[PDB]
Amino acid sequence: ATGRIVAVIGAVVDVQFDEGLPPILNALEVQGRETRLVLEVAQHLGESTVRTIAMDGTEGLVRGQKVLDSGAPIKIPVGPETLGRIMNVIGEPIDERGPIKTKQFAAIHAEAPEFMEMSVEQEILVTGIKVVDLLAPYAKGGKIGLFGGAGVGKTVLIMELINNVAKAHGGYSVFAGVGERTREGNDLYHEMIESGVINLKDATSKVALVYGQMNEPPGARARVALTGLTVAEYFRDQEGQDVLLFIDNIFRFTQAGSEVSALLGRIPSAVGYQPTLATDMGTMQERITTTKKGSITSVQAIYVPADDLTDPAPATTFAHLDATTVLSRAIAELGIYPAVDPLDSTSRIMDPNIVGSEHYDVARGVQKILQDYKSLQDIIAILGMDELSEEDKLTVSRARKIQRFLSQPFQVAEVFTGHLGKLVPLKETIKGFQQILAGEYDHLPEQAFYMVGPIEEAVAKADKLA
Amino acid sequence: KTGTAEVSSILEERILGADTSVDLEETGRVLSIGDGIARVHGLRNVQAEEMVEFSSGLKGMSLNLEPDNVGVVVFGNDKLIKEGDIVKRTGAIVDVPVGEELLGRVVDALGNAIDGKGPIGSKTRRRVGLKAPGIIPRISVREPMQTGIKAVDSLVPIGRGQRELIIGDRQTGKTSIAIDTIINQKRFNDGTDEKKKLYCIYVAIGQKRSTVAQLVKRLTDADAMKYTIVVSATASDAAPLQYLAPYSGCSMGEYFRDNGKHALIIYDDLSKQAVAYRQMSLLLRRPPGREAYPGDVFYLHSRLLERAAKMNDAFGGGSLTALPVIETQAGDVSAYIPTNVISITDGQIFLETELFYKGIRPAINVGLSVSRVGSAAQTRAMKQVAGTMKLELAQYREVALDAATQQLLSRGVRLTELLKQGQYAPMAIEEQVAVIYAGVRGYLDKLEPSKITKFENAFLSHVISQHQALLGKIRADGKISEETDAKLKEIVTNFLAGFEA
Amino acid sequence: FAKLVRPPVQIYGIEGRYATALYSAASKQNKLEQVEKELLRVAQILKEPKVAASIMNPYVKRSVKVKSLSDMTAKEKFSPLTSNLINLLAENGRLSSTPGVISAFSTMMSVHRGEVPCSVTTASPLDEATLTELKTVLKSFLSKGQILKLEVKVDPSIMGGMIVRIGEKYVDMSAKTKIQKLSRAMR
Ligand SMILES: Nc1ncnc2c1ncn2[C@@H]1O[C@H](COP(=O)(O)OP(=O)(O)OP(=O)(O)O)[C@@H](O)[C@H]1O
């Protein structure tokens, strides 16, 4: 079947066929271009006419050009041969090392796992960061969010989780860059070569990379998160392994659907997004699950626009997560890195059965002394410190050291300040918050608790300022 | 459902015989005009984003193709166009003249001279709608780009290929950072080492026309208009000419990057571009979003600032540095537009409007100014000294008769006054490293704070004369060795004995 | 563009745009009476169950509904400019509104000799002398040399009077002279 391009409006191309109307989600091929322009059927308008969405720039299309139906959805090369390579939206090698040679091909638009395939196992994934071990612990095989504004650390943190968790992992890894800096995607490819994760001489590489960046058209950022997902479905289903799935950033999948929803002729909903906003996120996000064959451990990174957590795009992804780490800027101004909100970070496995009865009791004492300090900030700012009680000059004097003890020097931020990266075990971040909540360290200043590892370096710092 | 081309002037051409003396393949008419875009009937072989020509002499871009008509975005005013005209098809994508033969002119956004010096003499044309380089050809930054400002070159260092924001309110000294970058390249463009040459491009969006004219004199007064291009779409120009101004400005810098040369471009400013793209969007009846902006403002500034990159050695080895300018309303760094550009560029420079009033100039907020990738690419002479001043400017900021407080409150004010700088005085790299040396090695700790602007203007004016041949080994060897710093100890302590307090 | 002649009625709508574009091409070349005799027979040859079907049926195509009509208008009588009109109506999908274009064209061509007829709505039809007297005083009112047409309707709700309209004039002598007795109340 061949068709004629009838209307080109931005990044939405219209096509009229004469026989053989292709069904929805089929790919088409445009005839007469130097590169490869591939469309994607999105509607049927009647009078034997479809309406597509283009996956590259539509500069130079004449009304009457010929387009050829492929007969099937977009199929990318998948397998263990795609490890150690880079792939674009339609699965072509963009690393100038030759074609990707596999045996089988998998479509992009696949359906979700059923009800009788969901596994109900819950474990704990110890990371090494003091704030996310204690107050919101991470589960193996479940989704993980990372909320925050623009400039708080949603990528210095996600490159620390790669440095700790994914390097010592035994399974496979998949990175999918949706709408970030292209100079950052060059640095990730050039750090995994020196650290030996990707190897260009033999066949012992452990991570695949998928990339559709911020200089891409809106039709190619709205479909690249389905490509880095379909690569990580082979490593779970047809091999039976434990994978990791880092996506950054997932808000660009939502933003780039609103750019094209105006051109498709729709009535727009609230603050400016598409009407089908929560229908097509649930269709995407219910394909990243731990089923009865393997475990997908997705660590996403979500962007909050204009620091507003009531915006419909970062407030409809809260129903799809197990853990949650809300970053904030007002903590990052004081110099507390990572600037994790302690009273807004939630978790699902926080339960006295799974994590214990000793972990659960110290973690709830920390959220109690930090909430009572938050209710006195309206009075300390007006009437000063000398108007409180005597027992309430101890909630203030202890919460101002737990706040500074939730700071930690990261490993990837060695080139920022020149301090050493520190890692703590889970059994030692329980002991550090007992010897502060009890009152063992009421003879030290607050700045001695600043940017250290475990509790033993806090007393090895207060002897300096003597 | 009534049709744009269901009018009686087009049905009559069809109902009275299919007429032969109308082309309808390379030329068409104009059905309506007035909201910006025009409704052109015909032109059945036009491409998308292809420049056309009107009968009045105006260029127009083919934006929106439909089965009935074509919607042409009109560059310039739309009074000259009338319903019933005839529009011709050029046959090429929107492109601008580009080459080495533009250094010294003042063009407008379409590539025509408005300085009154005749035609330009160009031979090559590049498109404005090209894509950024991918992941393979880029490489990390390694060469430093000097500024000549003592607060920027030692605290937020820049490198050849790194985006850097300049963000602040009105009348805080935004443009006067961008002017001193262009004048500081006089020392390199007039030398013999070709590997350190650097050109410049200035893009003026929405400014007054009488402020660009008083700017090209200041560059001609300092011999800086022989390596600088200026693109200009001022506030009286039409709205499509301000939208397409940084694209034509960046396509003239992409020539030098692909041919082994280094460029530099200052967009001034990207705030007034986004209020020009807002106007063309709402005049096309598009759904507004936050602050009545369209939904694709992030596509506007990301597809432009992704081109500023550094190629690898197999692609020539050139670069392209960008320095956009954003204006905030009363310190609002949490608005829609100043967060869409913080989440693109590789760092920030903050200009406070309440340090510009207290007499500190340039009013650089040292607490909120960061530069991530450009810290590893600076001179080891500067890193050996400015790595120490980074510590004391931190310890001054926590303490804001006690012990361990009146020591840091003494030194921390002598380093704040050491970082003031007069206008249009770009310093060299090796003259900075002696003045920052005296303030961090503990020599001016005894003086009064008011008599330290007098001290820097007296020490530099003499060591540039009597120790000129002994200063060159800092710039030549690129570092401070054990023989230079033992020599530098005697230059200062002999000058303080002669400097009359 | 070129100029186009204005019709003396100037109606509006999607059907008036096609009865004006034909009047601007048939007043040129002096063919305003040849199209009218053709258009009163294309109304007959559309409403046949072979041809009224598969023109409103949306599932055929655009192009094969043209070819089934490009020979139908070619073989019987027509090769004027009007064959392009049926060719243009089938391209734009406006083949359903073809009785709307035809019925508009007759009144647009009527006013070239017509008079916008009257309406006398009083009662049962009366004798011949009352009818010929109103037909010979209304001829004195037109003053345009055109033989006026007229319609009579029966409406018994008016008590003893009659209302008369001449185009857009509408004199009135009816039961509203009983509603003018509010001067006994409103004063
Ligand atoms: N280092 C300096 N020392 C003294 N004065 C300065 C310095 N830098 C700038 N100024 C003064 O600041 C004034 C305004 O500077 P500038 O033109 O950069 O502001 P601006 O932010 O560009 O204004 P706008 O953006 O509203 O056009 C200048 O007239 C100049 O006198």
Ligand SMILES: Nc1ncnc2c1ncn2[C@@H]1O[C@H](COP(=O)(O)OP(=O)(O)O)[C@@H](O)[C@H]1O
């Ligand atoms: N642990 C840390 N130590 C020092 N600086 C940090 C740390 N974490 C984040 N930052 C600062 O926060 C900023 C975060 O930027 P980045 O993570 O690159 O992108 P995003 O805007 O997506 O967070 C960086 O500029 C970095 O300087």
Ligand SMILES: [Mg+2]
């Ligand atoms: Mg980031």
Ligand SMILES: [Mg+2]
């Ligand atoms: Mg200015």
